[PDB]
Amino acid sequence: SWLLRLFESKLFDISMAISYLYNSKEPGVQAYIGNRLFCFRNEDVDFYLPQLLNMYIHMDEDVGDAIKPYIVHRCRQSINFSLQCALLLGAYSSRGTKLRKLILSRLAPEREFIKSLMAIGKRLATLPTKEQKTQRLISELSLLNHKLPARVWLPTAGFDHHVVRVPHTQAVVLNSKDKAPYLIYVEVLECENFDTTSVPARIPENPSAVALKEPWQEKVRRIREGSPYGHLPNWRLLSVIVKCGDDLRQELLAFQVLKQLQSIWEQERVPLWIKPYKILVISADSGMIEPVVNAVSIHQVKKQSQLSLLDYFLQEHGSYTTEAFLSAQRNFVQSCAGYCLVCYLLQVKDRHNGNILLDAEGHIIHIDFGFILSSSSAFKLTTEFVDVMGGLDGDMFNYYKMLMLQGLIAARKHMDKVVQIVEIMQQGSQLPCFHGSSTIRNLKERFHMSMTEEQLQLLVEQMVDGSMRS
Amino acid sequence: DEYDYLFKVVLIGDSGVGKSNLLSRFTRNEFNLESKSTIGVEFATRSIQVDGKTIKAQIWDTAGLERYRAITSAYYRGAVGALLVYDIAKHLTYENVERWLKELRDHADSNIVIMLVGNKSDLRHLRAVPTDEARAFAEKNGLSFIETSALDSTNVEAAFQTILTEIYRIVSQ
Numbered sequence: 035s036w037l038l039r040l041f042e043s044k045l046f047d048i049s050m051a052i053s054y055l056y057n058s059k060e061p062g063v064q065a066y067i068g069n070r071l072f073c074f075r076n077e078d079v080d081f082y083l084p085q086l087l088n089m090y091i092h093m094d095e096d097v098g099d100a101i102k103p104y105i106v107h108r109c110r111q112s113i114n115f116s117l118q119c120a121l122l123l124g125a126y127s128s129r130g131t132k133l134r135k136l137i138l139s140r141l142a143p144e145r146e147f148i149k150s151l152m153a154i155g156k157r158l159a160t161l162p163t164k165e166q167k168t169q170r171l172i173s174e175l176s177l178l179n180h181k182l183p184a185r186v187w188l189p190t191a192g193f194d195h196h197v198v199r200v201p202h203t204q205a206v207v208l209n210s211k212d213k214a215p216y217l218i219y220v221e222v223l224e225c226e227n228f229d230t231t232s233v234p235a236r237i238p239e240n241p242s243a244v245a246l247k248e249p250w251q252e253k254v255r256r257i258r259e260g261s262p263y264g265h266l267p268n269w270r271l272l273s274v275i276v277k278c279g280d281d282l283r284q285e286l287l288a289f290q291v292l293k294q295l296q297s298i299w300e301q302e303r304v305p306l307w308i309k310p311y312k313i314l315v316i317s318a319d320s321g322m323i324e325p326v327v328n329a330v331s332i333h334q335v336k337k338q339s340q341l342s343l344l345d346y347f348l349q350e351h352g353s354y355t356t357e358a359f360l361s362a363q364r365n366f367v368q369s370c371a372g373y374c375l376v377c378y379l380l381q382v383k384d385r386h387n388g389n390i391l392l393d394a395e396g397h398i399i400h401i402d403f404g405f406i407l408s409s410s411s412a413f414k415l416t417t418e419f420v421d422v423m424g425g426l427d428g429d430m431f432n433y434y435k436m437l438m439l440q441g442l443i444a445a446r447k448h449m450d451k452v453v454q455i456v457e458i459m460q461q462g463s464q465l466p467c468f469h470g471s472s473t474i475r476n477l478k479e480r481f482h483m484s485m486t487e488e489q490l491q492l493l494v495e496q497m498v499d500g501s502m503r504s
Numbered sequence: 505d506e507y508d509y510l511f512k513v514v515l516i517g518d519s520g521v522g523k524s525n526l527l528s529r530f531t532r533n534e535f536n537l538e539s540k541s542t543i544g545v546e547f548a549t550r551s552i553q554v555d556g557k558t559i560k561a562q563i564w565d566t567a568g569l570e571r572y573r574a575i576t577s578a579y580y581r582g583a584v585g586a587l588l589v590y591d592i593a594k595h596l597t598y599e600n601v602e603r604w605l606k607e608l609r610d611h612a613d614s615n616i617v618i619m620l621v622g623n624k625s626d627l628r629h630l631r632a633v634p635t636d637e638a639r640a641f642a643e644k645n646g647l648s649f650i651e652t653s654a655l656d657s658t659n660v661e662a663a664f665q666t667i668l669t670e671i672y673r674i675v676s677q
């Protein structure tokens with residue numbers, strides 16, 4: 035009875051559920067948990083869909099069969115849910131296939147919408163310049179409006195909705211590469227529930243067309259004002275980056291880890307700052323990312339401004355005697371400490387200013403999570419960053435160290451939640467981040483669970499000293 | 505002290521359906537998720553009163569695995585009652601109830617009282633055998649029927665107490 039006691043206690047949450055499901059070899063437990071999933075809140079379980087489905091694919095049939103009923107149940111009440119299942123099932127096997135086919139058996143509008151977006155991106159390979167690509171993109175996106183509005187949505191959106199319109203003149207291609215990703219803006223009308231409503235009616239259309247470097251709210255204004263649907267209160271603007279030829283599965287894994295660390299740090303009371311950005315896996319090949327707006331790469335901030343990072347801070351926020359500056363500095367210091375910790379724990383590599391974004395309030399945001407964990411430069415603290423923090427002798431810089439210690443102590447207290455996420459994903463995985471022999475073992479070592487706090491203080495110093503040598 | 509009757513009852517069914525926990529629930533009010541396959545046979549006893557008479561029931565928990573099915577059938581001998589159990593959440597286990605009753609018309613008294621038991625009623629959302637279909641089959645073949653959860657303990661007492669009572673008044677005249 036002691037086990038069943040626990041399962042019926044307050045301590046039982048979806049995490050514990052998944053853990054037992056993953057570990058227990060008892061079919062009675064598997065079935066018991068399979069049934070208890072229905073009792074949990076959708077949102078809580080949703081976060082773990084990749085884990086559940088990975089287990090389903092790569093684990094013993096008993097484990098799959100305990101999971102399936104719940105999945106099918108969710109699939110029947112939400113086509114969004116159906117979609118993500120079908121997309122994930124396919125992506126994570128290259129067992130899955132039988133159920134995927136059954137779920138796809140309706141969704142054609144969405145799947146064709148996505149196919150076309152993917153198809154567009156693949157065509158731009160023949161245009162060797164960014165600017166030429168952008169021209170063809172814009173033209174080709176306008177053709178999508180001929181099919182809108184439809185039973186189509188962006189899974190990356192916080193809410194239920196219908197897609198009505200694509201402001202094609204606003205779309206842009208992000209590099210000159212062969213399989214370049216491209217950023218688009220999408221218009222939508224919010225729902226309270228998708229599955230039982232609308233598909234709104236077309237409004238035929240006709241300055242708003244011109245595209246330039248401007249803040250997010252100024253861009254919404256311009257697009258809205260030009261849009262047929264812009265008058266409605268129901269109307270909102272979304273954005274996605276479309277990656278037609280890039281795997282996003284590590285990117286998804288990192289997201290979960292970032293999201294967990296973020297909760298961990300909110301629950302303990304450490305004001306580190308980070309920004310998980312949503313991921314949508316579409317195939318092993320392809321997916322989408324929801325971008326952070328009002329942010330641009332550090333590198334390009336220095337190429338268009340011709341300034342030093344600090345000089346740019348001073349230009350964009352004010353003199354160091356201003357509130358706006360001191361606030362931005364704080365966001366800098368808090369976002370740096372956050373991301374340092376993420377980089378260390380996940381062993382994030384390939385770190386350079388093309389991969390670090392700066393938002394309009396002063397937070398930095400790290401971005402290219404190829405090269406994490408076992409996959410094989412590390413996170414650096416350049417003097418340019420130290421300058422923005424007010425220097426080595428600075429109080430804000432000491433505070434950066436303080437935060438790092440605090441966030442580490444916090445992380446250790448909730449380590450299992452983090453490790454869980456990675457370890458279940460490793461299962462049948464041929465992802466480069468699991469190439470090594472000791473991925474999870476090394477991950478745990480990096481939490482330094484044996485250490486006394488005095489020891490951790492030292493480790494933080496060593497870490498920081500290390501971050502500066504280069 | 506003294507019983508008026510000693511009723512020998514067997515629990516049979518596919519491996520995994522919950523026989524051993526029906527028994528542990530019924531005789532010591534205990535249940536467990538973690539399980540050890542029943543090797544051959546297990547014994548437990550409990551006394552009840554029906555229509556004023558103390559009846560001691562001797563229950564033999566048989567084991568559904570086939571490795572042991574030569575030696576379980578030994579104990580079918582002279583048993584007055586049999587709980588034939590299936591798992592509500594695993595359809596195959598219900599499918600085999602027909603072969604489990606032929607198993608009584610080869611190694612056991614031809615005039616025995618049977619109750620069909622759908623166990624694990626607590627797994628609502630995993631249900632693979634509808635209550636109506638089962639109870640239909642139950643009386644087409646002259647069997648009494650009930651659904652239990654050894655886990656939450658629903659109907660476990662009732663199940664036993666029903667079959668023992670049913671038995672106790674076949675005997676009279």
Ligand SMILES: Nc1nc2c(ncn2[C@@H]2O[C@H](COP(=O)(O)OP(=O)(O)OP(O)(O)=S)[C@@H](O)[C@H]2O)c(=O)[nH]1
Pocket residue numbers: 060061062063066517518519520521522523524525526536537538539540541542566567568569623624625626627652653654655656
């Ligand atoms: N949820 C739930 N699980 C149950 C119930 N009854 C039994 N189980 C679980 O089923 C599994 C197997 O049950 P068990 O007690 O071995 O049945 P059995 O028929 O004796 O199996 P065997 O002895 O022929 S090998 C165990 O994990 C047990 O915890 C029930 O009513 N509800």
Ligand SMILES: CC(=O)/N=c1/[nH]c(C)c(-c2ccc(Cl)c(S(=O)(=O)NCCO)c2)s1
Pocket residue numbers: 208215275277311323324325326327328329330331388389391401402403
């Ligand atoms: C203006 C701007 O850069 N907004 C963005 N917001 C986000 C989350 C961006 C992002 C995040 C991750 C990745 Cl992986 C990409 S990317 O388009 O695929 N860049 C590849 C190498 O940079 C872009 S880009």
